[PDB]
Structures are given as C-alpha cells and as structure tokens.
Amino acid sequence: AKKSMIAKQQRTPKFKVQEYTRCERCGRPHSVIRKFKLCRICFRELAYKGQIPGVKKASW
C-alpha cells in the first residue's frame, strides 16, 4: 500500500502539522534531504548517473 498515501502526501491535509515529507522520485517517507526533496536510495542513483548539477563524491 503506497499509492494511497503518496496521494495523501500530494493533497493538503487538514492541519499544517500533518504534511510530512516523502521523497518525490521514489516514495520513501524516511530520510529525505530538503535541499533536493530526495531520499538516499534514488538520490545516490542519479548522483552516480550525473544529475544534481553541483555535487561530487567528496573526499578530504
């Protein structure tokens, strides 16, 4: 059961509290980064692919 409450996330809830954040490309509710509205799995995917113009594999 995923489509129903991704649709819940899409529609505005009855209170300003309830609008939790789900990742938009892949509907995981946990561990999204606000700067991309993306969660780690499908974030790392297109990160290795090349998207997200500014980010690189870091090292120091």
């Binding site: 938009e24 490309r25 606000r34 700067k35 991309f36 509205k37 993306l38 297109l46 990160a47 290795y48 692919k49 090349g50 998207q51 997200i52 113009p53 500014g54 690189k56 594999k57």
Partner: protein, 206 residues
C-alpha cells in the same frame, strides 16, 4: 561488496554532470523537472535509441542537447515530429524550450547504446553467448582499447541464476585518469529478470 560506479566516481573531474545549470532556491524543482523531461524523452525515444541528454538553463528558458545518430533520422522525417514532441516539453515545463541533436558517430563505443543493444538482443530470444561474444568484438574492431561486459539473472537455466562476463583488452578501473564510460540496462524476460552492465576503456585524458 561490489565496486563503486566508475562514472559515478569520475564525474566532475574528467566528466561533466550532463546537467550544466546553476540554481539556488530553485534547485529542487529545477532538478525535478529535469528528471521529468529526461524520463519523458527517454520513454518516447527508446525505439529510436538515445544515450545521454544534457540540460541547460538561461533566463528561465530550458534548452536541451540530445545524442545518437538515430535522432539524426528523426531530424528529417521526424522534423515535424521534433516540433511535435518539443511542444509537449513546452507544455510540461510551462516556459518554452530549445533543443539540439548531436550525432554520436561510431555508436559501437557508447556504453548506453551498447547496453540497449544487448538488452534488445536478449529480449528477442537470442542467446546471451552469441549476443555478448559478438558485441564485444564488434566494439573492439570499432576501435576501443578494452571492453568488459556482464549479464546476470536466470540465464536460460531458469531454476537458478548466475553471473557471467566476457572481456578482451586493457580496462583499468582503479586508475582515475582513464575514460571508462559506463552504462547498464534492464531486460525483462519470460523466465525472470535480466540485467546488463557494460563499460569500455576509450583512452586516458591529458
């Protein structure tokens, strides 16, 4: 425990992001519509085949460049079709868009095109042995320095899966100076799921 993605590692040092626009406070939605248009054009050009598409931003006007020689054939007959589809991109993006078609000469050494070739040969019932062993030498005589290609899944022996790969040439993955282009593709079969991974050593960079 498997290897890091080679282009994933090489981005930004020897490879460009294929999304060459700066944003700030609009990064999330710019990125989102970039994925949306990527998905749309890949879906609707899969038959014609295309490897990589770059996106560029100017005055809120998106502009695109799209690869592979077959969209070259989409220039002539599909020249009407190019406008027809880019109308859809205009509708999606809200603000109107520009496009460009760049021809990849020598398609035998593009990773994604090779992967799509292998995926199609697999899905139309050809044996992995013939397909892969023929494609490797095709690319080699096309003039790569080294190739390694790999398929996995229920390889005919449906009751159990396994892994297999062929290669002939020089292919350094640990060196951060090579130009190891990488791609992967998914092939759905009746007896299960088949995945493909192909990369080629083109040359070093200086």
């Amino acid at each position: 425990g498997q290897k890091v993605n080679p282009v994933g590692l090489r981005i930004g040092v020897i490879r460009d992001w294929e999304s060459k626009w700066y944003a700030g406070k609009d990064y999330a939605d710019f990125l989102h519509e970039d994925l949306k248009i990527r998905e749309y054009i890949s879906k609707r050009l899969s038959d014609a085949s295309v490897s990589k598409v770059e996106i560029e931003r100017a005055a809120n006007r998106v502009n695109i460049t799209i690869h592979t020689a077959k969209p070259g054939m989409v220039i002539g007959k599909g020249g009407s079709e190019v406008e027809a589809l880019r109308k859809a991109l205009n509708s999606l993006t809200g603000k109107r868009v520009h496009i460009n078609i760049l021809e990849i000469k020598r398609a035998d050494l593009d990773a994604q095109l090779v992967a799509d070739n292998i995926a199609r040969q697999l899905e139309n019932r050809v044996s992995f042995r013939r397909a892969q062993k023929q494609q490797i030498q095709r690319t080699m005589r096309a003039g790569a320095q080294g190739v390694k290609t790999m398929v996995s899944g229920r390889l005919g022996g449906a009751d159990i899966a396994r892994s297999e790969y062929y290669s002939e040439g020089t292919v350094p993955l640990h060196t951060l100076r090579a130009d190891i282009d990488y791609a992967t593709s998914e092939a759905d079969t009746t007896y299960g799921k088949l995945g493909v991974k192909v990369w080629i050593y083109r040359g070093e960079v200086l």
